[PDB]
Design a protein around this nucleic acid. Sequence first.
DNA 1: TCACGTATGCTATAATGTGGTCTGACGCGG
DNA 2: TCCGCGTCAGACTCGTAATTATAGCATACGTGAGG
RNA 3: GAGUCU
Lengths: 251, 277, 50, 1341, 50
Amino acid sequence: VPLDGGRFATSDLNDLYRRVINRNNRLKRLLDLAAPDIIVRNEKRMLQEAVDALLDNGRRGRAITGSNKRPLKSLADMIKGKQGRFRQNLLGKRVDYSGRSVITVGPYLRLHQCGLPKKMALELFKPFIYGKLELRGLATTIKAAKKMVEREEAVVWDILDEVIREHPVLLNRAPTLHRLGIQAFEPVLIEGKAIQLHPLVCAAYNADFDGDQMAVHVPLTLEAQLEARALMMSTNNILSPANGEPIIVPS
Amino acid sequence: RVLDATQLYLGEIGYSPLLTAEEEVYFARRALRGDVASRRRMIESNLRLVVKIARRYGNRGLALLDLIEEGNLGLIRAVEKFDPERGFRFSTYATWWIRQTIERAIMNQTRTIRLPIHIVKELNVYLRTARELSHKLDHEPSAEEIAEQLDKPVDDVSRMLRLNERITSVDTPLGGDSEKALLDILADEKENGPEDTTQDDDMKQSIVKWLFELNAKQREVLARRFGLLGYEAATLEDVGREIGLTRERVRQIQVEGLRRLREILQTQGLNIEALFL
Amino acid sequence: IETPITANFREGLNVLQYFISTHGARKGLADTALKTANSGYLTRRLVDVA
Amino acid sequence: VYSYTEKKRIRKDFGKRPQVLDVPYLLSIQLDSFQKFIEQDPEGQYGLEAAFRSVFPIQSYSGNSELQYVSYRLGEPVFDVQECQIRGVTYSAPLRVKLRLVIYEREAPEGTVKDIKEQEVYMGEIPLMTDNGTFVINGTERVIVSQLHRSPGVFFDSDKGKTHSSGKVLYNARIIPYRGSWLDFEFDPKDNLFVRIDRRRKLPATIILRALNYTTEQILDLFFEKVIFEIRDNKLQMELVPERLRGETASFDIEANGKVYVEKGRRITARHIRQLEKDDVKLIEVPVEYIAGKVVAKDYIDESTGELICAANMELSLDLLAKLSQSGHKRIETLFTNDLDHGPYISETLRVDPTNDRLSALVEIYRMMRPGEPPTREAAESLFENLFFSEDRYDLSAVGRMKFNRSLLREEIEGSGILSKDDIIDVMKKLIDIRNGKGEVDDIDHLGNRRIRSVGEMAENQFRVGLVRVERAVKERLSLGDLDTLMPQDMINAKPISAAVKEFFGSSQLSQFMDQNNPLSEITHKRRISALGPGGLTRERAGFEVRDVHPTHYGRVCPIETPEGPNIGLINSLSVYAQTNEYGFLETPYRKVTDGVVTDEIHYLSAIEEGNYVIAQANSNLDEEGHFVEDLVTCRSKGESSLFSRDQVDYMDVSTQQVVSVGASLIPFLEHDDANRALMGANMQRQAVPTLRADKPLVGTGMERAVAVDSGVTAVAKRGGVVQYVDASRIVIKVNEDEMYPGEAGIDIYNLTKYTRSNQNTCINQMPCVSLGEPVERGDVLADGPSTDLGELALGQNMRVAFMPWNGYNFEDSILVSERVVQEDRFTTIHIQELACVSRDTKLGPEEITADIPNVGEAALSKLDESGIVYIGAEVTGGDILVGKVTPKGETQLTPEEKLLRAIFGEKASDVKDSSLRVPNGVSGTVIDVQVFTRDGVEKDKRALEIEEMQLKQAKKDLSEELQILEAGLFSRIRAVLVAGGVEAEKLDKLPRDRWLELGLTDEEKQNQLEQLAEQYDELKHEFEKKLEAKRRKITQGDDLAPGVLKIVKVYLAVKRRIQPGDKMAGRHGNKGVISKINPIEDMPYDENGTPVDIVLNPLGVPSRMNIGQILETHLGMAAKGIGDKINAMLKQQQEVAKLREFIQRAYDLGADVRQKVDLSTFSDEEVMRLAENLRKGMPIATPVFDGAKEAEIKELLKLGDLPTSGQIRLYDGRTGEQFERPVTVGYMYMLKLNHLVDDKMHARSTGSYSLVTQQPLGGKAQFGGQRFGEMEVWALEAYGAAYTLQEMLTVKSDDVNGRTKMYKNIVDGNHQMEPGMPESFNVLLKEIRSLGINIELEDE
Amino acid sequence: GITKASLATESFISAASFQETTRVLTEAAVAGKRDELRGLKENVIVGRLI
DNA sequence: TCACGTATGCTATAATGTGGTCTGACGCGG
DNA sequence: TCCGCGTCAGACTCGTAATTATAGCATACGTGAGG
RNA sequence: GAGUCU
Ligand SMILES: [Mg+2]
Ligand SMILES: [Mg+2]
């Protein structure tokens, strides 16, 4: 693919495939030319070296260094490592309708609530706004609804307030050691850029407000909303699943 | 424990015969006449020569073995077109052929985007000129400074130095540590976000509803022209193939369909709202 | 360490008591960075098995 | 005796220990080191001189041609630092080197009388270090961090177990050169000595001695003591050395003379040994059976036959003894090898050694490094000599030879860089000594073995690499070419050297963007030591021993400053007084104690020198101008601490501060803080963003002023004198005659840097400190940098703080702040952001920067001017266009809808797109500055041209004012010289100054002074012309940009950010917090006096944290402000200068045993009221580190303020008006706003762009990324029930392409149904496994 | 013990995702092993209901 | 049948075996 | 007994974007436009 | 590469 700078950028698999094709075609040539066997042998060694580098580079001894000196990333390397495809793209992924910010106390909150910044929530519930806007007939179509949100019109705030009502949001903190590292809350729209967390659940997250941050995730489907409200809600996860004791404890 | 392809091959080459002058002449006469053994022996004996030039041609494009192999191809052409009748030695003639084939291969295979020898040769002159400029101008050559010296076009010099720009690895993690590869930064430009794809669905669906809101003959020549309902996107004159068979009446009716539809977008709430986009 | 710190933080440490404190402190901090990995690797082995 | 800037505001000192040595220049390391690299030394091989003499002269392979080095020279820098930073170029000097091509005749033997061609060739530009200690690389300020590596020399180490559950300690020697192969010696479980050359395969150690031409008997004579066996008459005798037996068990009855000493089968104690030695025992009779096993030393042959009876190093028997006797040998030299002390190691190693002679040994060595390739004798001798005995491939360096010789207990420090045969044997000897039990292992973590490489050494090495690459090219071309036409410059290439150095100063790990949040961040970054990067440790390689505090770190490395992270222990801040010895070891100052009296004689001791002496502690009490008060002083030696008598004491710690680094020295009551919290405190001070109003610290230490001055960010006066002209831009000082040189005009101009961008996009602004017409001395602060008060370092703002809960608004470290803080714009911060717009040339055609942009509102185009550039001063907000840019689109095959749409509005808008630079979303600021970079050939923008008009006229004005003020100042001197011996006061002023070339006086020294001033005047006259031509050329000069790029427009925005909930704040005792709420003034706890508290911090974040420093800082802070409130009250009521003087003298001279005396009096009345006006906003106090203020001194100061001794006050709740039920600690804590603003961290995304291969959304806020849903987070949903939430996260939220669009449409349609699919990552996985040649198929239902 | 127990599971998609992926896939490829997707990790990988 | 970028082709003094980083650790096979 | 290969917590932020060297000229190979 | 939560 072309970078903006006019330059191109490519996978190392292309360098490994080009190695294999050059040496293979050179072998075809030297066979057409009836070359003496010492030279044929050298080319057959080099061909096996190139294929073995292409499949799994570094297993067959000294890995083939590309441009920096770093060994070229081969086929097996894209599957194997933790970074392969299993651990990185398949057993876990980057996710839509996800956000983050610094956390701060919400002592005024009830246990099942969390302060969610206005601008953050505006963005996460974009399709839900578009939808109500068209059912009220305030927006003629989606592109006009988008421009009304971009202008951040006063009627849009009132609609956004209506969508967020009784809609649970997942808060997550790294590291997620046990299941209470994810909990669902009913969000409370707040002016300001910081997420407000209920004190009593700070224990489960191991949350202290000296700059920790949290991920926000929006359960989209009716099913996901119900699993968040029933199974994952703060109120419903009071006892530690580890030992019988309440995790939700004053401190 | 000799496992290395290179050390094995170089062991095998050393283990060959070295040829003399009178021996080169005897074998060369038999070789051109088409001797099997003569060709094999002349090639095998002169492999050492390939390696000397191949060893002084590394760290430029391919690896030592790659260069040695292509250099061996030059050796073969050299043995094929050698003249033993001329008193002048084989080593002298072969050196040309080995350097030629190595250089040519290094100009083609090395560059990921295959760069033509014509541009490469021109590039060589630009670079050698830059070197002479750098020695006297303590600074480095500008594009315009190089162009002034060769009496050639600034644009042509800039195009060439642009092609010199070598390719960055996508798989390579950048942030010093293996933090994030470039692949993960760079998004798919050809794939539209679900937001954009959904907007086109809304437009395409509205059009079907807008086609059953205007006149029957105002949406029969406006859509069959753009290729909206029809199969092929025709022009004002080509709408005549269907039933219209007109040029003036087609252009009046196309624009009449659009003018009534412009007021349908001003009333529904777009027009200047959907103008920015 | 064979020599304990006799003093407390209200009293204030001297240069030698503070320098001697550093050892334990930094080993603690290095422990959080480096040992967390084996704890976490054990979580992951357990999870995969069950 | 105080300086002028100290007369304005004096800090009260609670220190009691007089400082015999002042804090040195803190950026000493970077400057000295690089200065050595560029420094022209004829002899002292340092940097370039060394590099050329090392490589050169390079002679050809043929030997006809040679190139030799004469000398080098740095051209002046093409662009100043300023132009480099703006343009984005490296600040460098061209390196021109004189080189002489000399040619020999091949026909004559070595006739040099053929061709000598000498010329000055260009080899790269070398980047230059700034006066501050930085390099500007591609327009970015960067610092190259000093490195810490294992010193070349020898090291003796030992696997403590590890290998062989046997648990055997295997000793090893490692000889490390500065350049060459490594030479390893090691033991095997079976006690065989082995050699690893370049840590390759193992070889018997004796083989290397055979390669150095050692016969077997010579080897044995080297390691082994000989024992002589005389065969007399019939009985066997052996020459006894009284001790040797010693701690052995007697195997035979030992009889001496006729009388039995040992009993057979009993252990020989000390008494037997002294009895035998005193009796003078030299022969003892022994049984023949004892020799079975003894090793013969020499070759013994039959003098009759002349054949070998027994070879050297052969185990003796009863029959070989018999054969030896009858041949005619009655003396047998046998090896002394009694286990225990004298082990037979080399004896057993010779039996393992398969080689015989020298050649056989050289062949086996050759076969190890080059396995397969047949030996030749020439090849094996060449290889072995080229390993450790070639001057070109092997170099221990001076430090290597020196550490090597000291480790082998030599007298001589200096010697050869190549290994001698004696060196290797001495090393083997010491290895074996250590195995025996006499002698010890060297410690790798010991700073005596860890050496510092700052910049100049590292620049030198990369520069040598460049030269070596060049040498191959040069030698190659010298041999091939004809010698006479060919000159030296056609052979040399500059690009290899330039490339080696460019890669160091740009690609290198140690070259990193300067940490410029604040002065302390900069100064600490420049004094960093890293064990990482090239030639060093890795995070993988790094264990736990290296990371921990070593005893030798005392006075050299900070124990309490190290990144809390993966780099913990590998990166180290330098101690305050620490410095590099000549060889590059760290050293620390110590006061010599002579005859018990403690002199001011100060000695810098290396790590190794320190171990040898007993050093008293700094806190040790000295008695008034002589010896220690106390009999048993607390000291330290041999790396451990206890009490000593006075006569034993050799030395003493110079300052109490020398243990600590710079950053930690700024922490007041460090003494009362846990070392962990203190570490994070020193670490967060570096993150402190400078506020709009730089406020001094009320509770300081005294390092404040040193740091502000040495950082370079403050303008300091070199010459002093009186200030002629102040301006918010410039300061001109007229110099005093005593420092003012009579040559050039004596007027210093300091131009101040106005509101400029930092690397962290913070604001750099210099304001003038002094007023118009103020007298100043050398080293006075003339202008304050960004985070500096009158000369002192001011990282943040002190505040009235109360420790008490609020309604959970300070739950876990959460901070409750008063609205008054926001109102007073304290912790309001300035961020200058640089945005660039690049006009590139594409295959379709060049991009245009016109204001004429398709599909754009009049609102947007209003702010752009004719060219398409936003106006200076214009306020902008997200989405506003800054630089309008359009890109040529190639023939757009449209969807029918777009054909219709483009037909309806008729806005075809040509063949062009919209790629305009617009303000990033949510960032909002005012445009302060615009820069335009155009190519040389391309026609300039209208806006670019008006910018050059401004720069040209401004340049003209600047230079004109230079020549005007310099001419006025110069004639003002001529006027004074002419009066000297020629009174013409009123007569000289009337005629024009321009017609003064005629004016002279009689021929004396004063006539020569007139000539100096006249030659300077005209020099300045032409100088002004050539300066102006240079400026004009640079302003017209078209800049060469990247290929493809036609022009670049850089916009600078200024953003004012307010403090707000989510913003991160901390103190200096590692006490962090996030702001939870901003409380109305009415609501905040208030005093009996009615004054509201600024910040309410949680008490419970102190006793757990064990940083008690913050509480002492708060009590003293209130006491400081108590006295400021008294001075404020006395200044409001005017009152008497006498009365103010009384109170202030009593105040400064309070402390029980205050070191600092302040004899107020001498201060003039005007100095006193300027001083009180500064002391009014709180008397600034200094608590040194480990010599700080005592509780009793703080309570005494509080009583002087009429504040409570408890430092607790009655508080009233702002809301209810009722009192809090108990006293609350209130006072002033100096607080810092760190770089971590919520504004920068808040991020949210519904749908966006998606990744190329994996199709998953991107990461990071910069790429508008979705949050990573990790394995850990997945498992949480698995533990719950939540299967739909998990599938959501796997499929429609990430890869599933069809699914995500379909579900988006459903959510706008309000269906809230998933309709899942197949994740594209898995499709890829399949394709990647089939690419491996594994058939992986989906089997259907 | 834990590591081997996780590799001994008769799902090769779980074994591969855990560790030793190269070895797991050669042994599965040679055995012609068929994974019927009973486990949780297997279903999460194919993006299905747990 | 050229016009114009691309491609193949040949040169003859003699020359004929190559040449960066160096240190983890604790487990478990073969 | 010694070498080989295999693992080694989880997110987040920034910031930047390099180097080398391969000759010169005559016929050979392919497509499009104009005569 | 230098950081921020654990
Ligand atoms: Mg905590
Ligand atoms: Mg925290």
